[PDB]
């Protein structure tokens, strides 16, 4: 029961600190993923017609903490700007290690050849186009944000697998629904929940 025994029982893709997310070859420029997840939330900031000079874009609470950067009135619409984006991604195909604050990536290991989403990478993706920054390891996502109970997760909430959340990460819909690539051969896609080797708290990223 650790595992969620349809997809391989060992911990996930762990990359570490702050990857280059952007290259570009022809200005000469490139970029990492919290350089983007920063001016990403700066411009949600903006859209909500709160952007301070004291804002880094970095929109994340304190662990544990109820209380972080975007207002609660204002959560909904951060959740539901998240959700577009994951759902943007279905289709994309599944990569070991794949992904960053930009999109679709590169994995790691037997990725390396890939273009595509793990569910770490398709989480930090979702989450950095409202400044919430996360690293790309599903067991280092699980230490962040608050715990819900996973009896009471509610949509925009993210499910973790496995001890410490380390075998898979997906993104709850609502209605019994969650969002990620599951495995090799496999895209991006909309699927039941899975209980098996479900962690027994889900974490919320933002407040409504």
Same mark, same amino acid.
């Given at each position: 029961?650790?595992?969620?025994?349809?997809?391989?029982?060992?911990?996930?893709?762990?990359?570490?600190?702050?990857?280059?997310?952007?290259?570009?070859?022809?200005?000469?420029?490139?970029?990492?993923?919290?350089?983007?997840?920063?001016?990403?939330?700066?411009?949600?900031?903006?859209?909500?017609?709160?952007?301070?000079?004291?804002?880094?874009?970095?929109?994340?609470?304190?662990?544990?903490?109820?209380?972080?950067?975007?207002?609660?009135?204002?959560?909904?619409?951060?959740?539901?700007?998240?959700?577009?984006?994951?759902? &943007? +991604?279905?289709?994309?195909? =599944?990569?070991?290690? %794949?992904?960053?604050? /930009?999109? @679709?990536?590169? !994995?790691?290991?037997?990725?390396?050849?890939?273009?595509?989403?793990?569910?770490?990478?398709?989480?930090?993706?979702?989450?950095?186009?409202?400044?919430?920054?996360?690293?790309?390891?599903?067991?280092?996502?699980?230490?962040?944000?608050?715990?819900?109970?996973?009896?009471?997760?509610?949509?925009?909430?993210?499910?973790?697998?496995?001890?410490?959340? &380390? +075998?898979?990460?997906?993104? =709850?819909?609502?209605? %019994?629904?969650?969002? /990620?690539? @599951?495995?090799? !051969?496999?895209?991006?896609?909309?699927?039941?929940?899975?209980?098996?080797?479900?962690?027994?708290?889900?974490?919320?990223?933002?407040?409504?």
């Amino acid at each position: 029961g650790l595992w969620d025994p349809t997809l391989p029982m060992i911990p996930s893709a762990n990359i570490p600190g702050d990857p280059i997310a952007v290259v570009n070859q022809v200005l000469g420029i490139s970029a990492t993923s919290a350089q983007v997840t920063a001016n990403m939330g700066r411009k949600f900031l903006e859209q909500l017609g709160i952007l301070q000079p004291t804002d880094t874009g970095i929109t994340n609470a304190p662990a544990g903490s109820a209380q972080g950067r975007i207002p609660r009135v204002y959560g909904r619409q951060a959740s539901e700007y998240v959700i577009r984006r994951g759902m &943007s +991604q279905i289709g994309v195909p =599944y990569s070991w290690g %794949g992904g960053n604050a /930009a999109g @679709p990536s590169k !994995g790691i290991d037997s990725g390396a050849g890939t273009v595509g989403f793990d569910c770490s990478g398709l989480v930090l993706y979702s989450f950095a186009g409202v400044g919430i920054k996360l690293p790309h390891y599903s067991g280092s996502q699980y230490n962040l944000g608050r715990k819900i109970p996973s009896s009471q997760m509610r949509r925009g909430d993210v499910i973790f697998y496995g001890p410490n959340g &380390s +075998q898979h990460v997906t993104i =709850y819909l609502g209605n %019994g629904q969650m969002l /990620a690539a @599951p495995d090799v !051969g496999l895209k991006v896609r909309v699927a039941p929940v899975r209980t098996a080797g479900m962690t027994p708290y889900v974490v919320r990223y933002i407040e409504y």
